[PDB]
């Protein structure tokens, strides 16, 4: 029956995300989405009894890296939205890696694992953009970026997190597929049109 496969099969919603991120020269972000696609697939593959036989690492590892991978995918998407220069880019990328690694270890299932990154990312983004709005005396990312990346990306972000943290209580089988799909579209829509630092 389809409900066995649907949580595993819907993990391939990130395959568009990695394909698009690679085409836009976001080669690091493409790793983090590809890594997440792999560990989210095998995290669900072990749980479903009828295909649990195929997966080859212990539940502890695939569980950790499905959560960590997702939380870091949100982080590198948001640290790609706010383009930073080399010393700040490399620092803030690594700040996410080290924070999310500890957060995923310390309380694996707690909403803190996503709240920490999304809160810190939003603070870093908003402080950079408010400084740039004060410098230019105008809406810094053009209205075109707000209406076609930030607005849609965060709209899918709210949808994904409300599917995960509310409506997963009503059903797991279809809602967790809608979650994989919704969140894969946030990781597409939050990315800029080109990786400017690729030159």
């Amino acid at each position: 029956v389809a409900k066995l496969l649907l949580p595993t099969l819907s993990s391939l919603a990130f395959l568009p995300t990695v394909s698009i991120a690679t085409k836009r020269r976001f080669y690091m972000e493409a790793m983090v989405y590809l890594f997440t696609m792999f560990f989210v697939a095998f995290s669900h593959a072990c749980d479903g009894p009828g295909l649990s036989v195929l997966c080859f690492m212990r539940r502890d590892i695939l569980e950790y890296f499905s959560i960590y991978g997702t939380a870091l995918s949100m982080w590198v998407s948001l640290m790609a939205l706010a383009d930073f220069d080399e010393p700040q880019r490399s620092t803030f990328t690594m700040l996410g890696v080290l924070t999310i690694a500890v957060a995923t270890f310390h309380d694996r299932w707690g909403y803190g694992v996503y709240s920490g990154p999304i809160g810190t990312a939003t603070l870093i983004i908003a402080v950079k953009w408010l400084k740039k709005m004060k410098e230019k005396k105008g809406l810094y990312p053009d209205k075109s970026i707000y209406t076609q990346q930030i607005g849609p990306g965060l709209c899918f972000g709210a949808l994904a997190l409300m599917l995960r943290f509310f409506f997963e209580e009503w059903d797991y089988t279809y809602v967790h597929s809608f979650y994989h799909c919704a969140l894969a579209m946030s990781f597409v829509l939050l990315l800029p049109k080109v990786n400017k630092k690729a030159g």
Partner: antibody
Framework: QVTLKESGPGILQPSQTLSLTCSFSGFSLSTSGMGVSWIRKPSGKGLEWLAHIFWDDDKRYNPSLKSRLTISKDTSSNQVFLMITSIDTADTATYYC????????????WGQGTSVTVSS | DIQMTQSPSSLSASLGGKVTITCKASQDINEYIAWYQHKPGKGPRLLIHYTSTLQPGIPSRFSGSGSGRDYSFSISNLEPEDIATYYCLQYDNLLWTFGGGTKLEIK
């Protein structure tokens, strides 16, 4: 509607200071994030930006000429005033004033533009 | 301030033909170009207020493209109303800088 109109002396001597005045309607420079700009076409040249004045009374001048521009504003009449000092034959130009917004930073309404010539 | 060059200083184009203007900036200006139609004896009109974003009430023939130091302005099947002088404005810095302007003429 949005409108701006440029008024000044037109014909005058070199080695003098001229007053250029911009009057506007459909908006007020008292509005949050609003700005008025001054720009001129020198005779047969490409366009040259001169000055900005903003809702917050912040001001900006062209580095090539900044020693001889003084911008100012009046939100009671809805007017903006620019003075060019020590005027010279290079200032034989059409002068324009234009409304910059907050949502998009490039000016989106220009006035009709007014001729300036300095001669004996 | 960042100097810009519009490649053609003047263009001769057929009524109902395509025409394009290339603008080259002296530095990367982060897609903050706007394109203006200066019809002689009148104040300029804003056509495009980012690299590609048209102003509302502008006919769909007008379009722009390019990114980082090289941008293009385009008209598809131009009308006799479109005969004007066309300027690009760099507006990345508050030190606003124009190109030299392109005088389009009917063939």
């Amino acid at each position: 509607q949005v409108t701006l109109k440029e008024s000044g002396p037109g014909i005058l001597q070199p080695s003098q200071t001229l007053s250029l005045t911009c009057s506007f309607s459909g908006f007020s420079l008292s509005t949050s994030g609003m700005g008025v700009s001054w720009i001129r076409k020198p005779s047969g040249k490409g366009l040259e930006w001169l000055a900005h004045i903003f809702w917050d009374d912040d001001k900006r001048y062209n580095p090539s000429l900044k020693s001889r521009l003084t911008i100012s504003k009046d939100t009671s009449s809805n007017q903006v005033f620019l003075m060019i000092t020590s005027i010279d034959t290079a200032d034989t130009a059409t002068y324009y004033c234009a409304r910059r917004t907050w949502l998009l930073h490039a000016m989106d309404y220009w006035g009709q533009g007014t001729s300036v010539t300095v001669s004996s | 301030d960042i100097q810009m060059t519009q490649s053609p200083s003047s263009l001769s184009a057929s009524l109902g033909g395509k025409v394009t203007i290339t603008c080259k900036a002296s530095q990367d200006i982060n897609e903050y170009i706007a394109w203006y139609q200066h019809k002689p004896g009148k104040g300029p009109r804003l056509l495009i207020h980012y690299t590609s974003t048209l102003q509302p009430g502008i006919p769909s023939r007008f379009s722009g493209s390019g990114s980082g130091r090289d941008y293009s302005f385009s008209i598809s099947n131009l009308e006799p109303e479109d005969i004007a002088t066309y300027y690009c404005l760099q507006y990345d810095n508050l030190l606003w800088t124009f190109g030299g302007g392109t005088k389009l003429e009917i063939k």
